[PDB]
Design a protein around this ligand. Structure first.
Ligand SMILES: Cn1c(=O)n(CC(F)(F)F)c(=O)c2cc([N+](=O)[O-])c(C(=O)C3=C(O)CCCC3=O)cc21
Ligand SMILES: Cn1c(=O)n(CC(F)(F)F)c(=O)c2cc([N+](=O)[O-])c(C(=O)C3=C(O)CCCC3=O)cc21
Ligand SMILES: [Co+2]
Ligand SMILES: [Co+2]
Lengths: 381, 381
């Protein structure tokens, strides 16, 4: 059931912004680890005395990494005279965010036809304003509302080069890395109580519940009209035998915030080969391997979609596989991206539901919870 | 002239500790960029609820990267019951250091025979105590005094595995990277006024002035008895045509602090080939190239130490070369290690002064200031 209730028109994810203490080191780690090119900068070299911001891109995926400079470099400025390229930026907000959460996502930015209307409609429907709409170089409008915790939903609209004031990175300082990652598929929040969080976000966006088909979670997925923009939210299930991963998140994150980013690959086998190659030389580690019992039940589940060679390839790379009403989902999770057991990344590829591919094809892997529990018992046999 | 006036016995540099906001991302960037292996950890996985600390090693070089967790994980602890592996660590001090300076060096640690005596003698000779001596697991003693700015000089002594409470990193999660870097050669501070800084540090250590043989600097080098431990200090020269790099440092760093770490390589050609290979895929960038006039005057200076093949190799890699009373110095500088124009790294190899090699052999490149100025004029001809 898709009522198509978006209160303003939404296109697609535009970028994800990380708030960090050093944007250079995080951006270079992520670039090597995920195979993303350095494509735009805004910093001292471009006349930005406020923040350093570096953009990495892979296909349509845009990761922005931003950290503050000493406030003393911009003490003479006022908001109208600012040299920040992201006018919503605030030294104290950024410093307070990082000291509270460590490295994490500050803004989930979606592109809209009209960011000012998006902001107005949103707030008129209960969104908590975070930063009012501001027109950038007569070309781009940016506005922010609170999403959950200290994460904001950033609206971006273009009248017609990432953002004004950013410069393209020099050819020599930009290496054409690519491991097959192509776009952001969904962005997931962890909150203490799912009900109020869903009601708030569904309330100001018009996004509808997407619906799926023990685990330490309960969750729901909000989606835009074409279900391209997918924003799931998790809450803990207390009292379970194993402590809820969501509860561990909330404790180490100091409250609600973004849990994982799921990135679509055009070739999850190539992506995981390239990323695993680099795990111990600066890249990302992956979740522990599932038992062989899991991969010895994979043919009886998905053998109609993937060859026995590809199923062996899944056991080598640790890929998990689940099946929807409509399609198949290949998926794997990284270990946390930084010091804290908080944010992590999911790599995915979905097979099926072609019209282009419809969003959410295959679901989010809900069945892998019970399939992994069984193989755990079956292996100890 | 070496009076050998050390007030307590000093052996060698033990480690350099970086204070960061995320220790994972910085440590993985540095590991790939410099070719250093992950060798020890102290973090949640080892029962440290206070800080995450990761040690990288190359030859004798030890870089430690430390960031704080949420204070809430250790709210129930007191100093006697702490789970920190570095008892000098303080959440507020670390958070305040990083927000003030960004990524930078907190501790220059030197090994001594008796860290408690080192601390006592030091303070009795004017050192400002930073953290009193503390015996770790009946095996290791650690103590800290102020060095300059918010940088401390950390004394370490062993009765007889980096530090107690650290664990060796698992074989799979530790990749044998090595680009030829072998040990720390010197660590340089930038201060607003050299005189008072020298008097303070020379005052509590007994270190003697090492002495060398326009530039926006004036500087002096303090050295231990065998001149292995080398601690130069810079101050700005105001009024020069080009603004002093030291003054730019002090403004962006919010005051005095560590400017550069010079790392000895056993093969500076191999090191710079490996590091430059990785500049645009997560590693470190290097200083701009000198003109060819510089390398067209290199034979008439050092042609007795390096072949014309090696001199061509210097022009390819951008290596600079200077000559002492006693030896030859090969050297090159990175661009700053993080967002701010503050800390950077120097790679060096020295040729000569063999007895082992005596410390400081070749100097620190003082002549390259006037050799580079000339080649600049000669190239515009
Ligand atoms: C498939 N799957 C899984 O098998 N396990 C067990 C494993 F593999 F770790 F052992 C997970 O723990 C796991 C955790 C998460 N999560 O979001 O925390 C997700 C996930 O992506 C997801 C969403 O995107 C929105 C709806 C909620 C949801 O579950 C999937 C998971
Ligand atoms: C050799 N040399 C140089 O040629 N230039 C010009 C170039 F190349 F950048 F264009 C420098 O700027 C430069 C800067 C520094 N510094 O410390 O800032 C040092 C250096 O290492 C040093 C010490 O270790 C202790 C004593 C002070 C001192 O000068 C060497 C440099
Ligand atoms: Co997911
Ligand atoms: Co030097």
């Amino acid at each position: 059931k898709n009522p198509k209730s978006d209160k303003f028109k939404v296109k697609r994810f535009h970028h994800i912004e990380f708030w960090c203490g050093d944007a250079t080191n995080v951006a270079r780690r992520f670039s090597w680890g995920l195979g993303m090119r350095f494509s735009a900068k805004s910093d001292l070299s471009t006349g930005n005395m406020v923040h350093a911001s570096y953009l990495l891109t892979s296909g349509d995926l845009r990761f922005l990494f931003t950290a503050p400079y000493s406030p003393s470099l911009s003490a003479g400025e006022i908001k109208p005279t600012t040299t920040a390229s992201i006018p919503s930026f605030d030294h104290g907000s950024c410093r307070s965010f990082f000291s509270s959460h460590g490295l994490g996502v500050r803004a989930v930015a979606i592109e809209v036809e009209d960011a000012e209307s998006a902001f107005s409609i949103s707030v008129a429907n209960g969104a908590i304003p975070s930063s009012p709409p501001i027109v950038l170089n007569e070309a781009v409008t940016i506005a922010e509302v609170k999403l959950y915790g200290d994460v904001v939903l950033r609206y971006v609209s273009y009248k017609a080069e990432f953002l004004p004031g950013f410069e393209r990175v020099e050819d020599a300082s930009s290496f054409p890395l690519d491991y097959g990652i192509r776009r952001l598929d969904h962005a997931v929040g962890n909150v203490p109580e799912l009900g109020p969080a869903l009601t708030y976000v569904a309330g100001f966006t018009g996004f509808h519940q997407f619906a799926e088909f023990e685990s330490g979670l309960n969750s729901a997925v909000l989606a835009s009209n074409d279900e391209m923009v997918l924003l799931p939210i998790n809450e803990p299930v207390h009292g379970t035998k194993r402590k809820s991963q969501i509860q561990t998140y909330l404790e180490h994150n100091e409250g609600a915030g973004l849990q994982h980013l799921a990135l679509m690959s055009e070739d999850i086998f190539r992506t995981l080969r390239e990323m695993r190659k680099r795990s111990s030389i600066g890249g990302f580690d992956f979740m522990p391997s599932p038992p062989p019992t899991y991969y010895q039940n994979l043919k009886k589940r998905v053998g109609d979609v993937l060859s026995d060679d590809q199923i062996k390839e899944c056991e080598e790379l640790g890929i998990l596989v689940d099946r929807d009403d409509q399609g198949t989902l290949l998926q794997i999770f990284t270990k946390p991206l930084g010091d804290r057991p908080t944010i992590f990344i999911e790599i995915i590829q979905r097979v099926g539901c072609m019209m282009y591919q419809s969003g959410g094809c295959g679901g989010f892997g809900k069945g892998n919870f019970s399939e992994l529990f069984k193989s755990i018992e079956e292996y100890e046999k």
